Design a protein around this ligand. Structure first.
Ligand SMILES: CC(C)(COP(=O)(O)OP(=O)(O)OC[C@H]1O[C@@H](n2cnc3c(N)ncnc32)[C@H](O)[C@@H]1OP(=O)(O)O)[C@@H](O)C(=O)NCCC(=O)NCCSO
Ligand SMILES: CC(C)(COP(=O)(O)OP(=O)(O)OC[C@H]1O[C@@H](n2cnc3c(N)ncnc32)[C@H](O)[C@@H]1OP(=O)(O)O)[C@@H](O)C(=O)NCCC(=O)NCCSO
Lengths: 427, 427
């Protein structure tokens, strides 16, 4: 049936990294109970609201398939309720500051005593043992810490953050691997473990290819697939020439190919007024005859100045600028269809508007309309992994404290005790 | 212990997306057998080599903890060997182009018949059922299809690819989630499933916050925290003011926060000569009093135009221009310290040079020195999830076909048939 049916998750998370992890677990069938601050809740509820006093799309897109209980954990009665909840949980997830759970009385040691089967999973800024262990970090600071910012953007501009959530959502997906790995250990040992993912580390994992580059640069002095290896192409803001003679750390390479074959971002019709009217166009080394046919340069097929990767190093940017002239009168999609006829990896820059209403992504369940009769329906991203014998059923995000009484009832508390906790401001 | 100890992985993968998945399963204890083409093998072997006739760092950094066998699969005797290997495998992983494995005769349907416990795990460019289902896709093509390029970069520049591998390794890590979720399904049903991750979809999942923004924009006409909603700050190509008039798709926001918590990328001493001499500075609403102390401006505490997120939406870039001047004679690390005292999320742009040789990252096993006695040692990224009861043991990447006979003997074949496979040009 569903992979995580019958898995109970005690979810202390807030913001993005932690909640992305537990939401996706929820999508795969987990029973996720979200513990929130009494009164305000997860701060995404109030961040960037489109309607005042309605939970923001920030909250709803990260907290589907979850229930909510308000709990003040700084009270002693709040701690005893947590212990009951820990004893019934298979995994606890937290992305609080570095030592916050510990300060609350719940160290890994004490959790093991309460439930020797439970898995404790956390997101942190930096790994335990790191000099910067104790630092609070959000999305973009993590991108900077893990090498993405340094290697994203242009040689003549600043380190640039990625629009993708490399620090936070990525950390949450990384933690999901850790939790699932820990569930596989537990099948063998009958015991829970602690797993942790540092945001710096989740970022650095995606930037593996740039650590390849750093070593290539140290060993050889050149990165031949980068624009700066073309003589007299790249310049700094004062017009000084940029070459690998003077580069000792992997530079920004604009829209160069990364771990793909060489490529560039080429303008299509309307690029002046439409910010997303571009394609990415790849010059794979085994496809030069095809490219030559497409752009009507038969003379470039047998010329060694043009027909190997090595021959193209000194002129690759000129070749891209010439290919680009062939797209001046065609939109993204026509250029993509044209290239497809040749088998050339090439695709449009899809705008968020285009993605939000794309039939294909709705059909395959990647962009999903959530039914929310309280707030109005909204779109979210569903499960990016598609299975032959299981479909996710995405349900709306909880109102703050919506399930508090319902959850306290599942723990076995009589109606009178639930009454008292409301009065003492515990729940 | 070792999470995937005893899990047998038949690994057809090549390039980045698939190999990152299987390598990481290998780090967690899985037994990974990499099937490669005779003669050339995985295309990363020969891709941007730093030494002639030595496996490239592209290959070594993505194929540690794996054994290698060469196989001609377009041969009848090769197809028979695969059948036998499929009978002994828990998961097959593949990232050939659309229909490639099917064309070899190994459809999901036939695979089930051969071993009803096996998991088939696949990376493609686009999801099955998508209009672009049949297209071949590298790294940056997926960044473009999944919305990242459209939303990364500056408002007066092109769509920009991330240096991080959003398309390839990111898909690989999502596929790992999918595979481990199928192993959990299998504990219940006794049966294998097919799992697939589309590169477009793995990208989209990390761009969830931008689909939030797209809906905020459709509903309200504005994104108040984006540079373009700041009065007379952003300008287009021509000397011309930008605003959310006529913006209907989420625009590029340079180095803006991307969420509920504003930030920017600020220069530090050395920025003209050092591409990575910068910090990122987040302005968390709840830490606004803490910020006013370090900035040496006590006036902003009581001012209602400066003490709330709402009051700050029209002079965000004025505050950042000012905070930047107090960094002009301190390096990255000095500025990061000068904060930190105050608990401020602010950190340095780390260069690849700094990360490759950083003591902390090597202490925690995130950057790892691989002992490779054939090729010379190299660095790699280790496991980004850290466990209380388990340490990865990373071992060197295999030579092409280094383990062919070893693997052919584990299948129960004799010495003399191993010879005739060599002579018939199948192994
Ligand atoms: C997000 C953040 C950077 C900043 O968080 P913050 O605004 O400083 O809050 P915090 O540090 O998590 O929590 C403050 C305290 O309140 C407490 N708290 C949280 N929820 C509580 C509740 N319901 N009841 C009582 N106390 C609670 C915590 O115990 C914490 O401990 P201390 O007072 O002893 O320091 C930090 O939580 C963090 O570093 N998290 C890890 C990184 C991460 O996962 N970020 C993801 C999203 S990034 O875009
Ligand atoms: C990456 C890539 C674009 C490369 O494309 P390509 O170089 O043209 O290779 P391919 O299309 O995968 O394989 C070519 C053929 O050789 C075959 N092949 C592969 N290994 C073989 C072997 N050992 N013996 C015989 N044939 C083999 C395939 O069956 C395929 O056969 P067809 O003629 O029936 O299509 C493509 O594999 C792809 O789209 N993969 C899926 C998406 C992906 O993961 N890309 C990420 C790469 S990381 O950026």
């Amino acid at each position: 049936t569903k992979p995580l049916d019958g898995i109970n998750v005690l979810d202390f998370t807030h913001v993005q990294a932690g909640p992305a992890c537990t939401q996706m677990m929820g999508f795969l069938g987990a029973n996720v109970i979200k513990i929130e601050r009494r009164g305000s809740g997860d701060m995404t509820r109030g961040w960037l609201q489109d309607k005042p006093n309605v939970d923001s799309l920030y909250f709803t897109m990260f907290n589907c398939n979850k229930r909510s209980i308000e709990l003040d954990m700084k009270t002693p009665e709040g701690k005893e309720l947590l212990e009951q909840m820990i004893k019934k949980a298979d995994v606890m997830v937290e992305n609080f500051g570095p030592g916050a759970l510990d300060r609350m009385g719940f160290t890994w040691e004490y959790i093991q005593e309460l439930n020797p089967r439970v898995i404790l999973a956390s997101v942190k800024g930096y790994a335990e043992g790191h000099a910067n262990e104790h630092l609070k970090v959000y999305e973009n600071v993590a991108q900077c810490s893990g090498g993405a910012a340094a290697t994203t953007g242009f040689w003549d501009g600043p380190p640039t953050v990625s629009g993708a959530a490399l620090g936070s959502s990525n950390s949450g997906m990384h933690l999901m691997i850790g939790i699932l790995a820990a569930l596989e250990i537990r099948h063998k040992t009958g015991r829970g473990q602690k797993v942790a993912v540092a945001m710096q580390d989740a970022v650095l994992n995606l930037v593996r290819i740039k650590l390849r580059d750093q070593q290539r640069l140290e060993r050889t002095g050149i990165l031949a697939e980068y624009p700066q290896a073309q003589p007299n192409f790249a310049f700094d803001r004062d017009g000084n020439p940029l070459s690998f003679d003077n580069i000792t750390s992997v530079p920004r390479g604009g829209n160069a190919g990364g771990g793909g074959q060489p490529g560039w971002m080429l303008k299509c019709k309307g690029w002046e007024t439409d910010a997303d009217s571009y394609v990415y166009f790849t010059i794979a080394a085994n496809m030069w005859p095809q490219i030559c046919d497409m752009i009507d340069k038969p003379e470039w097929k047998d010329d060694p100045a043009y027909n190997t990767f090595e021959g193209r190093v000194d002129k690759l940017m000129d070749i891209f600028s010439f290919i680009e002239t062939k797209f001046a009168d065609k939109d993204k999609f026509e250029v993509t269809e044209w290239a497809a006829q040749y088998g050339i990896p090439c695709g449009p820059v899809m705008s968020m508007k285009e993605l939000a209403h794309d039939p294909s992504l709705q059909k395959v369940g990647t962009v999903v309309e959530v039914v929310d009769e309280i707030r109005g329906n909204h779109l979210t991203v569903g499960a990016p992994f598609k299975f032959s014998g299981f479909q996710p059923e995405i349900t709306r995000a909880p109102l703050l404290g919506e399930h508090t009484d319902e959850v306290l009832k599942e723990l076995g508390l009589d109606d009178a005790k639930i009454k008292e906790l409301h009065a003492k401001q515990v729940v």
